[PDB]
Amino acid sequence: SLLEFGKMILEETGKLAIPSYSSYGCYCGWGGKGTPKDATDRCCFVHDCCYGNLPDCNPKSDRYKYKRVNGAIVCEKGTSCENRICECDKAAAICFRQNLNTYSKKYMLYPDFLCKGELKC
Numbered sequence: 001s002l003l004e005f006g007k008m009i010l011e012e013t014g015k016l017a018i019p020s021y022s023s024y025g026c027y028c029g030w031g032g033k034g035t036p037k038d039a040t041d042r043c044c045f046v047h048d049c050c051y052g053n054l055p056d057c058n059p060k061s062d063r064y065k066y067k068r069v070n071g072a073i074v075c076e077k078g079t080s081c082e083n084r085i086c087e088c089d090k091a092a093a094i095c096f097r098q099n100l101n102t103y104s105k106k107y108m109l110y111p112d113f114l115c116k117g118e119l120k121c
């Protein structure tokens, strides 16, 4: 669910998911068009695509369980959907962490009209 993904992001990057990643670029937050602006935006694009591979799951509300094994994120056994949602979130958190060095404030509150393009998953 969104609440856990948010905590996963905070633990991983030290940034509050809601500011930092809820209105960033073309794909972080709500998005469905254009070419990802940078690496972080690409993390969100791939994250959206990951959820897209799970048509019958509900990522926002379905809660999963995960633990930290010395920093490593380990998804615990749950329903099929819960397991797959957790893996999608884990990947996004790591991706955000790997690209913190290029995160830019100029992409925060990015205007919709500047997201022009076609990028298939």
Ligand SMILES: CCCC[C@H]1C(=O)N(c2ccccc2)N(c2ccc(O)cc2)C1=O
Pocket: 002, 003, 005, 006, 007, 009, 017, 018, 021, 022, 028, 029, 030, 047, 048, 051, 059, 060
């Ligand atoms: C702390 C969470 C950061 C997560 C980021 C995300 O993965 N989704 C997201 C992506 C796909 C399905 C559901 C939620 N949304 C998002 C949330 C609310 C909203 O009305 C629109 C988009 C996000 O902000």
